[PDB]
Design brief:
The structure is a homodimer. By secondary structure, chain A is of the alpha+beta class. Chain A is built from eleven helices and 18 strands. Bound molecules: protoporphyrin IX containing FE (2 copies), ligand OS7 (2 copies), 5,6,7,8-tetrahydrobiopterin (H4B) (2 copies) and zinc ion. Chain B: This is Nitric oxide synthase 1.
Chain lengths: ~400, ~400
């Protein structure tokens, strides 16, 4: 059963067979589309089919499907599951799985890069201090003095769900947020709740507008522990504008390394609850969302004010005009400091080339239009005009609840 | 099964029950989301028609608070007898107006629906000829235009009978600009209308072969060959496009028309199919300034505008496209406002839609909404609709797509 997607700007039509390999559910039905909904322990009963499916995919990809090595590995995993109730991936399988979870991430526009992921095996880690060390090395490797390198660090898998490894931070590097008694917020409003937890755990907050949060790390189900990333490892970029000299005086900076640390990596039915991964920024993530969301730093006002635009009526498009300038400044600053960044024109064009290649070589590329189209200038990027099919493939990155809502405190 | 939608900027959560009354299908399944597919998809037989009529009359009589009343049961019986007899049935004027207003109310891709109950419905079911169609359409255009104070309207021509006697407006909009492919290979005028512009010429029309030539109407009554008519120019309100800061802007020679009037859709009420039902409102500025002017497959003016602005067009990371895009859309709103022609900017329209959504959830239990179409094609995330989860589902009465008549017409 073939399915076609059309690019309405170029009339290129692509045919998707890969969706037939899709198992998990989308949230949609024949009668409702949940395409804009943000968020729509395993027993050995269901674990071996998940392992077998993954291992068939793995051995197919290495052109050894049905081989003796393939059949012996299936045997070995089968015996390990009934004996021990779980199983361990080989290093080769772990690397394959992590790369393919990125390849399958339908909301990620950066997937042309999926095969160049640096995978750090942290499954021998046992303590929060051990986690801190692995994360420091990840941050140093990925940052590479501004020449950013994609990487993932994979901590031990879930066992009984009572011994999880978790990074309580949503990203490895993020700025604190403080609610003031007068109702205003200092710093990043998105991080107020997590900041409060850190402070309660003993963090001494400097209470500034761009304070790097401490790492809050949980090993083996124990209470989490606070660690401060060495500041020499945290690369930051002061934001200035190439024509507007007053822009630097707004006091803005951002960190160079985007490293998401709250998602769950699923490979062959195994669940890796701590698996921070990092690449590099698309400019709009900072310039549109981080700076200009009303619920974030929300700087459209001051920027438009210092630009002296007509702010009395929205039909002057003063918001749109300040938005472009802020995003110019983000890109200019990162390029000037030689820190890797990509603009949304380049990134969406690369994605279209990636997508067509995946249709040719793989039979499809699952893609979430709602997330792939950039949050400014949508229709002047090529993905806007591109029809896309969204479906769930494994290996995958999944959401998981924030640990402070489920953790059982040891005290 | 009583679904919730969250606004992530305001944490406002609405509960949707209206979707459980959904009739038709979305194109999605639990295995695949087709939310970004443009078109996800002979007469009604005697059996299919009556349930459709019953469902519609049930909701009509509920709306006037006469569900289960004398008049309700009598109308149910009356239509029931007429279908058994004539194999179709005729709507009363009151039901026709209700059906048209609720087709708009149910149009999940329309951001302008806060206005849905203030629709002027012109009953043209007594029409028999293309000359008569032309007359009704001129009256529509003049009424809707209202010397620049635009008024929403629909004109409804006779309903499909056996599919051989169809009324159709061959134009996609009542007012659109011609498109000609040039000798050197480029395109003069509107490329989206090149095929239609040539059906008009290859049928009788003689073209000024300019850049903004108003197309003639191609009107089909009762299944006959369509006929060409020129709309009186005094009835076509146009706006010369200038910029409030850039005096060279007028030298680009751009204009657009004031009246957006879609004429190629099919209106479904109680199973009856109205294949000719042109409807009109007023423009959101981005429809002209982002899509009509800046799509690469349309007038595609971004290069020339940025050149006159002397922006650095050598790299995409200068965001020269984004900067020009904003200025172009500033000029469109400025020109319409200057000439006192109704227009709405994308900030005002999306704020109105959020208010409408709240109204519909409160008074009706929900509002079907297609995020992919509701979010404007520029500055997406600084409009409130970007952060609003939406549920998309199909309610009837409805506007539907239908094939272009030249691919169908028994010529
Ligand atoms: C290399 C450059 C990369 C770029 C430019 C990039 C870009 C993006 C962007 C812009 C988003 C949308 C997020 C948002 O708007 O908040 C996203 C989502 C995502 N990225 Fe990438 N990314 C990159 C690398 C990676 C890597 C290395 C991984 C994992 C190994 C990854 C996994 C994901 C996932 C799983 C999502 C979706 C999260 C969800 O489902 O909600 N990305 N990416
Ligand atoms: C009064 C001001 C109105 C505004 C500002 C408005 C705005 C819009 C916009 C921006 C779109 C997206 C279409 C595109 O991007 O090409 C749209 C779609 C649509 N509008 Fe409205 N509209 C208005 C009135 C109306 C009226 C009066 C009707 C019918 C009586 C209507 C029915 C529709 C339909 C049926 C669609 C698309 C449905 C589809 O493609 O499936 N609109 N509208
Ligand atoms: C490796 C990499 C590079 C790069 N440039 N960007 C990346 C963005 C993400 C990513 C994913 C999901 C997100 O969603 C938050 C949410 C979801 C649901 C509900 C509420 N909030 C966010 C927002 N922080 C970011 C992940 C990795 C990235
Ligand atoms: C009343 C009113 C006012 C207003 N301001 N804008 C309106 C826009 C539309 C409307 C809907 C669907 C469309 O379809 C795109 C398409 C789909 C599939 C294939 C090709 N193209 C188009 C463009 N043709 C326009 C309808 C009514 C409007
Ligand atoms: C409600 C809506 O789904 C939500 O705001 C989404 C829209 N698209 C997005 N797209 C990206 N890339 N990132 C986001 O956070 C969101 N948020
Ligand atoms: C491929 C994609 O579905 C297509 O480009 C859609 C996307 N969103 C849109 N949104 C609106 N309002 N109008 C459109 O024509 C489109 N086109
Ligand atoms: Zn869907």
């Amino acid at each position: 059963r073939f399915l076609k997607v059309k690019n309405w700007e170029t009339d290129v039509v692509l045919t998707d067979t890969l969706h037939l390999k899709s198992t998990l559910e989308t949230g949609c039905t024949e009668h409702i589309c949940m395409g804009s909904i943000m968020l729509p322990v395993r027993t050995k009963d269901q674990l071996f089919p998940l392992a077998k499916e993954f291992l068939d995919q793995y051995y197919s990809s290495i052109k050894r499907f049905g081989s003796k090595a393939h059949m012996d590995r299936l045997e070995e995993v089968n015996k390990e599951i009934e004996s021990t109730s779980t199983y361990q991936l080989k290093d080769t399988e772990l690397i394959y799985g992590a790369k393919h979870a990125w390849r399958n991430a339908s909301r990620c526009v950066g997937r042309i890069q999926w095969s160049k992921l640096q995978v750090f095996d942290a499954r021998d880690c046992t303590t929060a201090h051990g986690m801190f060390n692995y994360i420091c090395n990840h941050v140093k490797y990925a940052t590479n003095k501004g020449n950013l390198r994609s990487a993932i660090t994979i901590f031990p898998q879930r066992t009984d769900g009572k011994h999880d490894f978790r990074v309580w931070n949503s990203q490895l590097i993020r700025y604190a947020g403080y609610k003031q008694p007068d109702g205003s917020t200092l710093g990043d409003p998105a991080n107020v709740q997590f900041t409060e937890i850190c402070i309660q755990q003993g963090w001494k907050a400097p209470r500034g507008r761009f304070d790097v949060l401490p790492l809050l790390l949980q090993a083996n189900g124990n209470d989490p522990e606070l660690f401060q990333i060495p500041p020499e490892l945290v690369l930051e970029v002061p934001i200035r504008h190439p024509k507007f000299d007053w822009f630097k005086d707004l006091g803005l900076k951002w960190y160079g390394l985007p490293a998401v640390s709250n998602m769950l990596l699923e490979i062959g039915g195994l669940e890796f609850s701590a698996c921070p991964f990092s690449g590099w920024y698309m400019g709009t993530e900072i310039g549109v969302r981080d700076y200009c969301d009303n619920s974030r730093y929300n700087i459209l006002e001051e920027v438009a004010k210092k630009m002296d635009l007509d702010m009395r009526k929205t039909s002057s498009l003063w918001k749109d005009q300040a938005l472009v300038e802020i995003n110019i400044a983000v890109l200019y600053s990162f390029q000037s400091d030689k820190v890797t960044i990509v603009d949304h024109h380049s990134a969406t064009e690369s994605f279209i080339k990636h997508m067509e290649n995946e249709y040719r070589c793989r039979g499809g590329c699952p893609a979430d239009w709602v997330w792939i189209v950039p949050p400014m200038s949508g229709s002047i990027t090529p993905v806007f005009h591109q029809e896309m099919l969204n479906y769930r493939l494994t290996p995958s990155f999944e959401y998981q609840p924030d640990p402070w809502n489920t953790h059982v405190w040891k005290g």
